[PDB]
Design a protein around this ligand. Sequence first.
Ligand code: HEM
Ligand SMILES: CC(C)(C)OC(=O)N[C@@H](CS[C@H](Cc1ccccc1)C(=O)NCc1cccnc1)Cc1ccccc1
Length: 450
Amino acid sequence: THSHGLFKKLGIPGPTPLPFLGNILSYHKGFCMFDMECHKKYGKVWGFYDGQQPVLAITDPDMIKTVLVKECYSVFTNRRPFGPVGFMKSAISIAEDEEWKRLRSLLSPTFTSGKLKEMVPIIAQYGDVLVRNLRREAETGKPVTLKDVFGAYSMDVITSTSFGVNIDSLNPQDPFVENTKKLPFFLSITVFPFLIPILEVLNICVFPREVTNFLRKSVKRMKESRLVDFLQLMIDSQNSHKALSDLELVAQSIIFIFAGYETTSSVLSFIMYELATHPDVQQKLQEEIDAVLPNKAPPTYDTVLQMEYLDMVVNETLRLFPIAMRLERVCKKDVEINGMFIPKGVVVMIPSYALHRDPKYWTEPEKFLPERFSKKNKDNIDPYIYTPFGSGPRNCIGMRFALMNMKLALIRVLQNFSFKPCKETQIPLKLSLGGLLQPEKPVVLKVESR
Ligand code: HEM
Ligand SMILES: CC(C)(C)OC(=O)N[C@@H](CS[C@H](Cc1ccccc1)C(=O)NCc1cccnc1)Cc1ccccc1
């Protein structure tokens, strides 16, 4: 301190920081709106402060490629630290430098296309659970809270694809549904991040210290009972890198569970909102599914990859609602990328949400228009502008699994039901002014049987 002269010095523009707070008062309308304003106010690069922490936004595709791919192992390797984490320091999304590179290696083969084709029959069976829990609400002409029913399915696939456990968590108190339920503080970190090590010597975990105590033992119950799913594929790996330890493995289990719980369910809710508020896209998708799977035939790994309009709908939804909002890398050395000095310790940020809604790359960016991703037009889309799964060595490892999971859900559900707005549906949907990509009011819709 005071780091607050850095961008003034480097000749990089940006909003003037308040003492201690930096620019965080500007987060009151949410990360997203702040980024969009800076992008129009300042242009291709700018700089702000989360407390004393300098953040350099970049929006040049080449420069973004340099950061995320070209200079990844050398400079922009780790994400911005947050804490206290405790033993979750060993989770892949959290770990750093060579220990991350190791965890990335030991867990990469789990996420292969071939391993994912063997999860399809299991992910298929809960697609049926999802339809019956839907019909019980459709036959009773009462509006439906999509996050609950998508959450219950997304919860079902996680427990199954990651440990073998098999519940219809919507309807009992099966010993597993509840510890995963615990699925203001985090803003006080930003002004006082010098207090993270304080909390790390106090063993306060941002992960409720009890959930983790439940699964550290629950895994070693499963580990010593067996002795097709993620835990097996990880136990099988630990049989050039030091093999995955037992606590290390639990920490990955925790990452996968959250990674694909609120994500899968949130995205599915954004897609169903768009398909209800655009009934022709919905009909057109329903037709393509009936063309590929006539007589409500069950989707397989290969018929899913055949559905091009389904892919367009998923991609365009993620353009509008990229649930990460930003990508970030901590610059670990004095570097120069594409003619611009970047001093060590700066956090480099890619404003994905702003870049997805930039009129300078998107005609009518607020409109939901799947055709942007027609095989005709899909080629003009800059892949360092549309980045819903990141890019380079540290992108979303669960990308293909998440696309596959969501699409199986949609096919099964669109085969059987159409989706209409209720009077209680929020149109236009508004994003949580807070810190997550979720709707302000939950998405509720009328569900009717075909
Ligand atoms: C629609 C669903 C999802 C979306 C849009 C999404 C998006 C992202 C993004 C943007 C990142 C940061 C990438 C970067 O920094 O370049 C990321 C990281 C990550 N994601 Fe996902 N994600 C989704 C679901 C999942 C799922 C289901 C898993 C399940 C295993 C998963 C596992 C991970 C991991 C482990 C990382 C950190 C990877 C690393 O640092 O090595 N994600 N995701
Ligand atoms: C800075 C602030 C306090 C505002 O929020 C964060 O601290 N958020 C990141 C920090 S790691 C996060 C750890 C985690 C585990 C369980 C519950 C919550 C969080 C993680 O592994 N999530 C996986 C994931 C989630 C979503 C998609 N794909 C994968 C989460 C993250 C974002 C983007 C890429 C990678 C991680």
